[PDB]
Amino acid sequence: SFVKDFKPQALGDTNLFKPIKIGNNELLHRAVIPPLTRMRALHPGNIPNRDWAVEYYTQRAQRPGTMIITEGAFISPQAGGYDNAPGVWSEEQMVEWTKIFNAIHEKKSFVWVQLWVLGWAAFPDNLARDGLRYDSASDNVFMDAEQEAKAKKANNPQHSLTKDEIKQYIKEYVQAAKNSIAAGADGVEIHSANGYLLNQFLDPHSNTRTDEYGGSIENRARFTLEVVDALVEAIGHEKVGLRLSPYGVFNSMSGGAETGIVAQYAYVAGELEKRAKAGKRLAFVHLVEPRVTNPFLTEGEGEYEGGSNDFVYSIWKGPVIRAGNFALHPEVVREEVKDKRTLIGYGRFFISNPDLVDRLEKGLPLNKYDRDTFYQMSAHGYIDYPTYEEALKLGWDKK
Amino acid sequence: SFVKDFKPQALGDTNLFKPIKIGNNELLHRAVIPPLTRMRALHPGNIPNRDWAVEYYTQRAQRPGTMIITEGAFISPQAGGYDNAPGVWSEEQMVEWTKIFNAIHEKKSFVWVQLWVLGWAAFPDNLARDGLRYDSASDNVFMDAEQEAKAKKANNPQHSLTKDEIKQYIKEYVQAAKNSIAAGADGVEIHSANGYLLNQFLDPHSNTRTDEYGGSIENRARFTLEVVDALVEAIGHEKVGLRLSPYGVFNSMSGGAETGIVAQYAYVAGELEKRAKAGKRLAFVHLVEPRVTNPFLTEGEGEYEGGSNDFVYSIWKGPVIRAGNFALHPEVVREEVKDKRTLIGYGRFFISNPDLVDRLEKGLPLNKYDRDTFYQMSAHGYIDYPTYEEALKLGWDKK
Ligand SMILES: Cc1cc2nc3c(=O)[nH]c(=O)nc-3n(C[C@H](O)[C@H](O)[C@H](O)COP(=O)(O)O)c2cc1C
Numbered sequence: 133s134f135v136k137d138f139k140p141q142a143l144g145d146t147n148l149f150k151p152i153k154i155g156n157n158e159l160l161h162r163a164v165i166p167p168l169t170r171m172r173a174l175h176p177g178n179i180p181n182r183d184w185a186v187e188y189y190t191q192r193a194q195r196p197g198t199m200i201i202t203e204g205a206f207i208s209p210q211a212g213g214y215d216n217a218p219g220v221w222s223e224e225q226m227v228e229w230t231k232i233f234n235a236i237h238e239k240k241s242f243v244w245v246q247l248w249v250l251g252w253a254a255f256p257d258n259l260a261r262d263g264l265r266y267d268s269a270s271d272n273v274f275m276d277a278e279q280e281a282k283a284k285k286a287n288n289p290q291h292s293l294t295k296d297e298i299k300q301y302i303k304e305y306v307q308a309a310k311n312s313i314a315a316g317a318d319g320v321e322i323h324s325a326n327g328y329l330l331n332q333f334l335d336p337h338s339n340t341r342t343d344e345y346g347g348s349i350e351n352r353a354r355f356t357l358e359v360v361d362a363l364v365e366a367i368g369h370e371k372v373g374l375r376l377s378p379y380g381v382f383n384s385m386s387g388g389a390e391t392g393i394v395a396q397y398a399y400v401a402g403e404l405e406k407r408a409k410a411g412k413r414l415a416f417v418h419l420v421e422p423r424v425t426n427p428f429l430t431e432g433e434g435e436y437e438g439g440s441n442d443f444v445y446s447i448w449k450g451p452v453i454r455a456g457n458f459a460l461h462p463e464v465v466r467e468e469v470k471d472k473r474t475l476i477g478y479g480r481f482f483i484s485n486p487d488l489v490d491r492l493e494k495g496l497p498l499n500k501y502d503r504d505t506f507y508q509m510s511a512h513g514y515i516d517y518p519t520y521e522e523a524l525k526l527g528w529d530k531k
Numbered sequence: 532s533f534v535k536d537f538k539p540q541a542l543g544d545t546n547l548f549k550p551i552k553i554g555n556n557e558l559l560h561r562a563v564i565p566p567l568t569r570m571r572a573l574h575p576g577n578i579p580n581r582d583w584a585v586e587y588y589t590q591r592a593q594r595p596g597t598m599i600i601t602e603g604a605f606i607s608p609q610a611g612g613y614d615n616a617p618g619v620w621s622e623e624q625m626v627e628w629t630k631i632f633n634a635i636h637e638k639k640s641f642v643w644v645q646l647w648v649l650g651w652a653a654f655p656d657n658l659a660r661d662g663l664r665y666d667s668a669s670d671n672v673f674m675d676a677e678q679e680a681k682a683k684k685a686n687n688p689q690h691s692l693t694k695d696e697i698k699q700y701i702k703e704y705v706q707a708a709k710n711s712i713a714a715g716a717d718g719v720e721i722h723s724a725n726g727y728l729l730n731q732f733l734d735p736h737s738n739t740r741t742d743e744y745g746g747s748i749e750n751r752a753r754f755t756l757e758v759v760d761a762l763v764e765a766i767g768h769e770k771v772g773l774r775l776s777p778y779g780v781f782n783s784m785s786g787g788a789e790t791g792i793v794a795q796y797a798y799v800a801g802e803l804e805k806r807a808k809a810g811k812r813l814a815f816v817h818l819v820e821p822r823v824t825n826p827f828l829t830e831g832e833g834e835y836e837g838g839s840n841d842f843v844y845s846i847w848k849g850p851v852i853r854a855g856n857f858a859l860h861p862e863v864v865r866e867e868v869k870d871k872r873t874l875i876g877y878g879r880f881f882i883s884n885p886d887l888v889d890r891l892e893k894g895l896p897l898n899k900y901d902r903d904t905f906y907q908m909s910a911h912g913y914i915d916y917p918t919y920e921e922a923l924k925l926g927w928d929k930k
């Protein structure tokens with residue numbers, strides 16, 4: 133059905149439909165598809181789903197000029213740990229990502245691969261099966277009880293990375309960014325949000341290191357800015373973006389309770405503008421809003437309103453994509469895009485509305501999403517959500 | 532005359548007239564008199580002006596319940612360097628500050644002494660006369676040409692403080708805070724703004740030290756937070772406040788051009804809320820707005836609007852006094868005091884309008900200020916600006 137009690141509002145008279153250029157791409161509108169894990173990749177191999185992934189992405193690439201950021205893709209085996217999310221390190225994987233990049237491009241939209249490394253959010257048993265370590269910034273703080281039980285049972289203890297092992301993750305990040313560009317992607321987004329490895333080094337609760345990768349604002353951001361610097365040398369700054377969640381608490385990050393958290397992220401945004409001055413301005417900064425602190429909570433659960441992402445605008449002066457509970461609040465978006473360099477990420481509603489960009493333009497109803505197939509190895513709940521027309525021929529009240 | 536083309540607006544229906552408690556004081560309204568140097572103290576001795584200072588302060592303390600922050604007062608001889616600003620280290624000085632504190636208190640208003648240390652803004656010749664060093668965070672960066680000529684001619688070179696000399700400034704800060712409280716002040720404001728010593732240690736352009744007082748966000752804030760910590764142990768946190776100017780460029784500070792500047796100040800605001808959690812919440816944070824980047828520029832000159840002070844509210848959760856070009860913009864104040872823990876500092880217009888708080892309440896015209904007696908050793912331009920009544924009996928159009 134459509135979202136029952138929502139009152140749509142057309143947004144076509146707003147800057148959400150003005151073109152803007154991001155990197156080398158000329159978006160026709162500013163609604164972007166933020167990275168969404170769906171768990172349909174194939175085990176063994178972390179292969180993009182050979183039966184349904186081109187159609188899913190082809191479908192969401194339908195309104196021309198859309199920026200699409202893929203699911204997070206693992207840069208290498210040690211970076212992974214979930215059997216059914218895709219990676220971007222092997223030939224077999226790059227043969228199905230090429231097919232996907234081309235079909236999006238057939239539709240004249242654009243595609244940015246999110247590079248993902250799990251840290252302590254990985255399942256330590258999977259990793260153990262495969263001979264891999266269970267990594268994190270430190271080893272005396274664990275994500276949670278379940279993860280702790282899981283590592284003891286796999287007998288795969290959490291491991292504090294050595295400098296030489298951080299350096300190998302910087303080697304795999306560069307390779308995986310060269311492989312995505314070589315296969316046809318328009319750019320890569322570095323995932324340094326949502327409690328995954330890079331964010332475990334940025335946060336004071338998960339990073340209790342004493343070396344130059346922890347213990348100060350400057351040392352906690354170091355691994356994230358080496359990765360930005362190696363990928364801007366490897367493939368160019370117009371092909372790189374950075375996702376950050378300042379106030380997120382998913383996967384045991386501190387959020388707003390750490391009184392130091394605005395300084396930690398202000399510092400990253402400042403270094404990123406330092407580089408802009410020296411010529412190397414990244415394509416965009418992507419921010420998860422505090423209005424969603426964990427994406428597995430229903431819209432309106434875990435709004436963190438003792439803090440705001442607006443500080444970033446004072447420091448970074450380039451395009452900002454913002455994501456988090458914007459589809460059921462077009463009144464909030466209308467205000468937000470009055471800013472001229474703000475793009476809006478719509479995540480749960482791009483799952484359920486393949487044609488979200490026309491619905492937003494025209495003010496049409498929105499298809500409800502089914503939270504039970506967000507992760508399922510099915511086509512159902514993946515490629516079978518209907519466009520408005522189809523939902524009308526289906527008679528989703530209105531027939 | 533009155534400010535010719537201004538259109539007053541009564542503000543009595545706003546939160547600028549709701550009581551609020553700051554430290555131990557219960558302000559009857561939220562317009563506060565920010566620290567204003569006027570150069571009427573006596574040489575030798577840096578004595579408060581024995582003929583006109585009680586009347587000036589008595590006059591501005593007229594509407595009951597006003598918070599008054601004094602002129603900056605030098606904590607000790609080495610902290611000074613201007614002959615005619617007052618200090619708070621000797622018995623002769625404390626005998627005239629007592630008289631002043633009592634007359635403000637007679638009027639049932641409150642008085643907070645600003646503790647001041649000059650660093651490189653001092654005149655190096657004066658200091659040389661007296662046997663004093665010309666201090667700063669470092670010695671290979673000088674404030675400007677004039678200051679540089681002045682030090683060479685006095686042959687009083689800029690000196691990088693040793694740790695032991697920072698420690699002696701922390702001893703004099705505590706003493707001068709105990710002397711003001713012992714003489715009757717309601718509290719002290721630490722001046723760590725406007726390019727003076729503590730702000731020379733906070734800023735990356737003036738602080739090129741390699742030790743633990745420079746070279747990182749954490750080390751540049753260290754001298755400012757030891758001073759906060761020594762005064763909260765010496766006289767209690769409800770008696771201490773901190774003034775900061777994030778975007779100021781007066782006295783050669785970086786302002787908005789340093790891409791690191793929001794992180795540097797976010798970090799100070801975070802440590803200040805860390806302490807609040809441990810019980811020791813300071814009385815207030817006082818911020819100079821970017822709408823005035825140097826106070827010797829006319830209203831509307833040097834507005835810095837590529838940055839905002841609103842980040843501080845995300846981090847510090849206690850009272851905030853904001854100051855900077857608010858008297859000719861009551862429409863901006865109306866919006867700003869919708870926040871429930873915001874006080875407004877009015878500086879050039881409290882010079883010229885002894886009764887500013889009633890004029891603001893009632894929407895009356897404003898007396899122009901005379902910028903040539905801001906610093907003069909005269910009563911004229913100090914205690915002879917008229918109240919509205921007197922300006923009407925004088926016939927300042929309307930008679
Ligand atoms: C099912 C699902 C999977 C997600 N997986 C990822 C991911 O791969 N990488 C990422 O950065 N964010 C991930 N997110 C977060 C979304 O990108 C987005 O920040 C948030 O859901 C947007 O809020 P919204 O859905 O209210 O628009 C995921 C969200 C959903 C709903």
Ligand SMILES: Cc1cc2nc3c(=O)[nH]c(=O)nc-3n(C[C@H](O)[C@H](O)[C@H](O)COP(=O)(O)O)c2cc1C
Binds near residue numbers: 826854858877
């Ligand atoms: C004549 C004069 C002297 C000043 N001296 C000081 C001082 O002693 N300490 C301080 O922190 N600010 C000083 N200031 C700055 C004001 O406190 C205030 O931040 C700024 O002038 C307020 O802006 P406004 O005058 O537009 O209200 C001075 C300002 C003036 C106009």
